[PDB]
Design an enzyme around this catalytic site. Sequence first.
Site, PDB file in Angstrom:
ATOM      1  N   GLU A   1      11.079   8.225  23.045  1.00  0.00           N
ATOM      2  CA  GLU A   1      10.327   9.438  23.267  1.00  0.00           C
ATOM      3  C   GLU A   1      10.400  10.351  22.043  1.00  0.00           C
ATOM      4  O   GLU A   1      10.989  11.435  22.072  1.00  0.00           O
ATOM      5  CB  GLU A   1      10.931  10.101  24.555  1.00  0.00           C
TER       6      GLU A   1
ATOM      7  N   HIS B   1      22.879   3.552  30.699  1.00  0.00           N
ATOM      8  CA  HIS B   1      23.521   4.511  29.866  1.00  0.00           C
ATOM      9  C   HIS B   1      25.018   4.252  29.863  1.00  0.00           C
ATOM     10  O   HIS B   1      25.546   3.662  30.788  1.00  0.00           O
ATOM     11  CB  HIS B   1      23.235   5.903  30.544  1.00  0.00           C
TER      12      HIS B   1
ATOM     13  N   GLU C   1      10.705   0.955  31.074  1.00  0.00           N
ATOM     14  CA  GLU C   1      11.289   1.738  32.186  1.00  0.00           C
ATOM     15  C   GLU C   1      10.319   1.643  33.349  1.00  0.00           C
ATOM     16  O   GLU C   1       9.088   1.850  33.181  1.00  0.00           O
ATOM     17  CB  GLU C   1      11.495   3.263  31.863  1.00  0.00           C
TER      18      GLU C   1
ATOM     19  N   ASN D   1      19.664   8.838  38.727  1.00  0.00           N
ATOM     20  CA  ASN D   1      18.500   7.914  38.956  1.00  0.00           C
ATOM     21  C   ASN D   1      18.871   6.430  39.119  1.00  0.00           C
ATOM     22  O   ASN D   1      18.011   5.530  39.018  1.00  0.00           O
ATOM     23  CB  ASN D   1      17.474   7.984  37.788  1.00  0.00           C
TER      24      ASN D   1
ATOM     25  N   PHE E   1      18.125  15.638  38.297  1.00  0.00           N
ATOM     26  CA  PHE E   1      17.429  14.634  37.500  1.00  0.00           C
ATOM     27  C   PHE E   1      18.318  13.665  36.671  1.00  0.00           C
ATOM     28  O   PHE E   1      17.798  12.687  36.120  1.00  0.00           O
ATOM     29  CB  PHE E   1      16.156  15.177  36.766  1.00  0.00           C
TER      30      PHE E   1
ATOM     31  N   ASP F   1      17.861  12.205  27.679  1.00  0.00           N
ATOM     32  CA  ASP F   1      17.939  12.757  29.028  1.00  0.00           C
ATOM     33  C   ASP F   1      19.250  12.320  29.656  1.00  0.00           C
ATOM     34  O   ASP F   1      19.327  11.329  30.390  1.00  0.00           O
ATOM     35  CB  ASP F   1      16.719  12.388  29.898  1.00  0.00           C
TER      36      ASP F   1
ATOM     37  N   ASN G   1      19.286  23.992  32.782  1.00  0.00           N
ATOM     38  CA  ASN G   1      19.675  22.653  33.181  1.00  0.00           C
ATOM     39  C   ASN G   1      18.578  21.939  34.020  1.00  0.00           C
ATOM     40  O   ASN G   1      17.604  22.631  34.420  1.00  0.00           O
ATOM     41  CB  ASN G   1      21.061  22.662  33.900  1.00  0.00           C
TER      42      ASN G   1
ATOM     43  N   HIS H   1      12.469  13.975  22.143  1.00  0.00           N
ATOM     44  CA  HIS H   1      11.551  14.386  23.163  1.00  0.00           C
ATOM     45  C   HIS H   1      11.192  15.898  23.186  1.00  0.00           C
ATOM     46  O   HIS H   1      10.073  16.260  23.567  1.00  0.00           O
ATOM     47  CB  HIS H   1      12.194  13.991  24.526  1.00  0.00           C
TER      48      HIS H   1
ATOM     49  N   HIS I   1      19.819   5.249  25.119  1.00  0.00           N
ATOM     50  CA  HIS I   1      18.793   5.058  24.082  1.00  0.00           C
ATOM     51  C   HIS I   1      19.520   5.214  22.784  1.00  0.00           C
ATOM     52  O   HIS I   1      19.330   6.221  22.076  1.00  0.00           O
ATOM     53  CB  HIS I   1      17.753   6.207  24.155  1.00  0.00           C
TER      54      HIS I   1
ATOM     55  N   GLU J   1      15.819  10.078  19.416  1.00  0.00           N
ATOM     56  CA  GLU J   1      15.023  10.598  20.501  1.00  0.00           C
ATOM     57  C   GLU J   1      14.780  12.069  20.149  1.00  0.00           C
ATOM     58  O   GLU J   1      15.739  12.846  20.010  1.00  0.00           O
ATOM     59  CB  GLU J   1      15.621  10.638  21.956  1.00  0.00           C
TER      60      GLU J   1
HETATM   61  O1  GTZ Z   1      15.033   9.889  34.433  1.00  0.00           O
HETATM   62  C1  GTZ Z   1      13.768  10.029  33.780  1.00  0.00           C
HETATM   63  C2  GTZ Z   1      13.688   9.053  32.590  1.00  0.00           C
HETATM   64  C3  GTZ Z   1      14.678   9.419  31.520  1.00  0.00           C
HETATM   65  O2  GTZ Z   1      14.327  10.718  31.036  1.00  0.00           O
HETATM   66  C4  GTZ Z   1      14.450   8.496  30.321  1.00  0.00           C
HETATM   67  O3  GTZ Z   1      15.510   8.727  29.403  1.00  0.00           O
HETATM   68  C5  GTZ Z   1      13.129   8.786  29.604  1.00  0.00           C
HETATM   69  O4  GTZ Z   1      12.641   7.631  28.911  1.00  0.00           O
HETATM   70  C6  GTZ Z   1      12.100   9.077  30.621  1.00  0.00           C
HETATM   71  N1  GTZ Z   1      10.833   9.239  30.457  1.00  0.00           N
HETATM   72  N2  GTZ Z   1      10.315   9.436  31.700  1.00  0.00           N
HETATM   73  N3  GTZ Z   1      11.237   9.424  32.607  1.00  0.00           N
HETATM   74  N4  GTZ Z   1      12.371   9.144  31.936  1.00  0.00           N
HETATM   75 MG    MG Z   2      13.590  12.008  27.174  1.00  0.00          MG
HETATM   76 NA    NA Z   3      16.968  11.382  34.330  1.00  0.00          NA
END
Ligand code: GTZ
Ligand code: MG
Ligand code: NA
Lengths: 204, 193, 1011
Positions: free
Chosen positions: C449, C345, C525, C592, C589, C189, C585, C406, C379, C404
């Site tokens: 993830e 990051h 997290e 953060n 988000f 992410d 996109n 996800h 990550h 990752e």
């Molecule tokens: O900013 C949201 C974050 C970001 O995506 C992290 O990389 C991921 O582990 C995640 N899982 N849930 N929320 N997040």
């Molecule tokens: Mg993710």
């Molecule tokens: Na994010």
Amino acid sequence: DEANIETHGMVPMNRLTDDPRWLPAMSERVTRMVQRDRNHPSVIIWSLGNESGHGANHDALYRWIKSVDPSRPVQYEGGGADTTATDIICPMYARVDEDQPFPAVPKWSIKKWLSLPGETRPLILCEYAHAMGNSLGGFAKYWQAFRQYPRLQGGFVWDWVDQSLIKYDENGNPWSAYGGDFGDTPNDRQFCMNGLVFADRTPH
Amino acid sequence: RRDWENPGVTQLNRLAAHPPFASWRNSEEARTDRPSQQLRSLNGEWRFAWFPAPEAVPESWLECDLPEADTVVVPSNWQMHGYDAPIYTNVTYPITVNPPFVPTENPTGCYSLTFNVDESWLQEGQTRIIFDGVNSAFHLWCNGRWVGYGQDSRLPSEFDLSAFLRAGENRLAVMVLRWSDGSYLEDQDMWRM
Amino acid sequence: RRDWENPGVTQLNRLAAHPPFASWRNSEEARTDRPSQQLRSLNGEWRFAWFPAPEAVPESWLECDLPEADTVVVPSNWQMHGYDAPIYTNVTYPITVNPPFVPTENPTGCYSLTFNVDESWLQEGQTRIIFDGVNSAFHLWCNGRWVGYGQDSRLPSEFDLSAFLRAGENRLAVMVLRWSDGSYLEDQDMWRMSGIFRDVSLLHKPTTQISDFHVATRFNDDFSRAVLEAEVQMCGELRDYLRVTVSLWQGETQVASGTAPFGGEIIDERGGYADRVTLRLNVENPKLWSAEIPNLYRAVVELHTADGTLIEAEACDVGFREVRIENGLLLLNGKPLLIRGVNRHEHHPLHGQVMDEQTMVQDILLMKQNNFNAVRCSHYPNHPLWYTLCDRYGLYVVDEANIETHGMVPMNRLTDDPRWLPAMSERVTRMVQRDRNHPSVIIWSLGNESGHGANHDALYRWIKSVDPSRPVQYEGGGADTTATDIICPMYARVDEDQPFPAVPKWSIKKWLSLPGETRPLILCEYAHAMGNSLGGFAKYWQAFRQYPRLQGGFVWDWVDQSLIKYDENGNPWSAYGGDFGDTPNDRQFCMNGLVFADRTPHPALTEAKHQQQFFQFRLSGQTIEVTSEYLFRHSDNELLHWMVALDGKPLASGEVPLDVAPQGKQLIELPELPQPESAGQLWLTVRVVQPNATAWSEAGHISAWQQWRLAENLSVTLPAASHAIPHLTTSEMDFCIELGNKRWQFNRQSGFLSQMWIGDKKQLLTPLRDQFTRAPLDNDIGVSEATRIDPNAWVERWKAAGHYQAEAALLQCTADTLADAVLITTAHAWQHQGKTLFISRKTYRIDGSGQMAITVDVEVASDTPHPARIGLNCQLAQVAERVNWLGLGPQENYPDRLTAACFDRWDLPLSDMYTPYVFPSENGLRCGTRELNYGPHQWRGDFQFNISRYSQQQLMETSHRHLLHAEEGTWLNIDGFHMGIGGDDSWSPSVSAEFQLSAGRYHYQLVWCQK
Ligand SMILES: OC[C@@H]1[C@H](O)[C@H](O)[C@@H](O)c2nnnn21
Ligand SMILES: [Mg+2]
Ligand code: NA
Ligand SMILES: OC[C@@H]1[C@H](O)[C@H](O)[C@@H](O)c2nnnn21
Ligand SMILES: [Mg+2]
Ligand SMILES: [Mg+2]
Ligand SMILES: [Mg+2]
Ligand SMILES: [Mg+2]
Ligand code: NA
Ligand code: NA
Ligand code: NA
Ligand code: NA
């Protein structure tokens, strides 16, 4: 059921098996086996291969299996027959009463092995009673132990049939050939004939 | 690419492993474990020719049959047919230990087959080839075009020929190598074939 | 071959991974970690041409620089130079999901470099090229001859050019593909970029060289004695006379040293390693490594001849420390940690994903200055320098493999697949192989993830197996699988269970006690810091302190990933998801962080600092009890400062030296305290000051504080002889009130205070009206889309209820005259689609003293969603330079995020009263205010407020902060009550119940007057 992995001739044995660069190749030998054979009721135990020392690749592969197919114990003899990659103490040629304390990878009397401090796994010899030529001297002694000690659960004799091949003489008379006979060199001579039965199935 | 000198490469274009299949198109047959129209044997008489190294093979063999070739039975071990000798070595590798390399003079078996494929197989679905046992590594061509590559002399290697075949007659070409990086993984105490 | 669409092919001719080397030919340079003439950088000016696809590559490029090529700096991300767009997608793969293929039009970067090579390099030895980081795959050519290929954008790929280089001038050719089968494992992410983003260099090693080395440190029971064990391997020809010496230094002092020829112990029936050697060194009374005191030693490894001739030397920083989990607790050096961590990051506002030392150092100091003791590499493996830094400054690090997926459906689609085991394993084994010697790394992570598949259990085991010194963790599949030594959830709540099917997120206190569970729990997290967030941060810290097995966590996350965009005036603006024409996109988000991309802190940062304090305090009588939460150091760079003030006016204060043992307590008795000359609340403030500068801080740095109300004296003194009398001027339209040079006008139809004057000056641009909504925070919004609404989001419940559309209907408006006062009474309704949302009943009392007393009683229907706020608001006509108040500050603070604020008297420039989050929202509020000052105005009571040039409307109507425009006047929001802001997660309602405005009946009172 045993993976096609044996690296005996490496120095030291675990040269490749401890090498992360060889994990991939090794894994296909393990994963492809399980994927093909996991529905056979006859398969009761998985084996990680033969005489390849004990490498990190073994412990990872050991876990993969326990994890994808819990239905069966996983064993492996390398690295001393009782490492963390085996559910079963599966030594090859450990004797009944006699210890053979080789360094690093000793072979204890099986009776003794079971009760080493901390030990509690069952013991099944992966290879025992080398049936080469005029052999099987002392076979009853294992049986005796097998029946008296609950955790001594048997073994797999080495082995079923001589690996002799047929060659023909000047009259086309077939005779049993062994190592070196095909002009092969270097070779292990008669070491490829160790069975309970002749190559043609005739009993020894 | 010399794929046979790289444990990083153990297969090319090979299909995923799986329990034994026959794709019965009749349930009762499946129940009875009877033969399946969809599962055909290629066992039998094939075309073969021995070479001393992969470098000695003629591109021509891809396209057309080697007239020097003999007609042999498959499956088999070429040593059992005298093209070369089988070696009995227990522990010591039959080749110099210099992983993942293999000797340059590396006995090569060029197997070939001309076979039929019914159009019914081609109108729909998928047609795959299955080699239950190729020792120690091989390349495969179908109708002159490269299909893929495989290792591990003791498990089935499966490829999709669906896009390579044609109704009717067809030609397979298999180049088998004696030694490969997979040989390092096959040091069992037995004849080397 | 299209090696890029085959997970069985991860590289071609790539050399094995190993710890950082430099091939020094002088031991001393080695020990001191100075530069080596054998390690060159090829960073700088290179040639680059961009392509849409590999197939379009002029095969000429191979031998000759193409002309259309430009000259660009490297490392770099080509998106950063404009050849193409970076894309911000969270979960959704940026390419169609069809493993292992990638799209046919695949942006291709053609890098090439003309450089000279020292023949001395070629006459002997081996010359390798090293790519610290290539995103996502590449083929390499050297002088027109193909060298090899590599994947995994986050770890070094190395090739031997020894046979490809020539004396003098040479050409390197590099084809980097944006997409490859590797992207499948790179679904993080964050922005999607590409190119040669990490260093490129050349390393010259002798033929007979050190090829790998491992350092272990084991201890006795009280850590009074250690054994340093170092395993050394070689490549080249073995010879009897070959030697290895390993020596250990505590600075200039050589602590220990040992020498042996090659030849390991027998390991199997086949014997042992001829090409390895293990040296062992006793160390007595080791100075131990921790994030509290980052004590290091230097390890030098010399490969030499028996005559004494050095071949080469390698080396590393060594930290003596043991990590182990015992009886459910994570111990370091035998003591249970408390992780005050943050995820971080690698991101740079202008440089995209290219990292530099300055930036790294800047992050670390901020970290430390804010009481963070740990970091997780979210990550993927970081640029190598990060680790050297964490080692030296002292930070506990979680090193995570670059895996990752996800976007797969379900998530463990690839990770449970044996065909993906090999590519996965390299992402894990090559990480371990490179970073295993760094003491800052205390835990390994399998990635992020990717669900939980069999590949994870296999890799979990390989690690435990190769390096038993560090626990292994992984959160996928439920956070407590068989592939993790630590319960490491993401966003699990403190007391609130969130029972999702299959992977529920239990309340952390409850997670620990599930039947049979015994592991420690450290969140990977938590406290998603998006926008105005961090609401309820204190609830986590309280639990961590109360429960032994609750060991802290990693906030998400350090910095906003906004990139810099410039407008037509060539003025910079912070951009996010979609601002590059990138689509689909994830909009805002990617922002953060606790700091802006430029490293300016967000207000939440302060909240983190306070909660993460190392000293706790207790007050009793004139007795203060300081308890140290340090586990190893004494408070040797600390003094306590205390002050007592009365309603901000300073009364007394002093300082005492602190001298606390780790885990100890100290009682400071306070001096007899004089009573005071009048009504009001006294307040005690303590603060911990570090008198001296350190590696990460300046002299005078404040590391902690706390406050307590002491005695209070209620005013009982009765006003005074009203000098004059307000006059009321009733018209059929207005209730007008006059007193001196002041007038108030109340519109009889509206029922509000339409205008107020001082002199002949109007004070208001818009009437004073109750307000019940806020321009939506990121957390109020959650995932809610205008094309896909999340009806559960606060914003949605509010909109839907008509809160932002409710209209004030007058119910009653009266004016009455009192002995010495004028009293106006009003009653208003706020309806929507025929229902009464709220009822506001007020009274305005104007006295001869000229103060306007306001009394507000609000009613909120039980069945309507709890409102964002309950207050009043107006647009003042005036604009003044400063804001002064007595209450909580100095920074922005909210109900669920105000522990770090202190009550006192504060004064700042108007602008400090507005938080510039990229995604605008309600911001800049201050709670617990007893007095507020602006222009000639003064408000008193017990309230919260914000004041800026932006209406709530404009804010909630705007999306980028750079499009905001100063309105006429000043917007003033004064609240009786404000809704907490939440933050546990930013994708669902996370405001705790006790912060919700659900009492039904609310009462507030204010006094507005003039100065
Ligand atoms: O900013 C949201 C974050 C970001 O995506 C992290 O990389 C991921 O582990 C995640 N899982 N849930 N929320 N997040
Ligand atoms: Mg993710
Ligand atoms: Na994010
Ligand atoms: O015939 C001797 C046998 C044979 O080589 C087996 O494959 C091997 O596992 C072994 N170890 N020790 N003796 N043997
Ligand atoms: Mg290969
Ligand atoms: Mg053997
Ligand atoms: Mg690939
Ligand atoms: Mg002190
Ligand atoms: Na028994
Ligand atoms: Na034998
Ligand atoms: Na705790
Ligand atoms: Na907004």
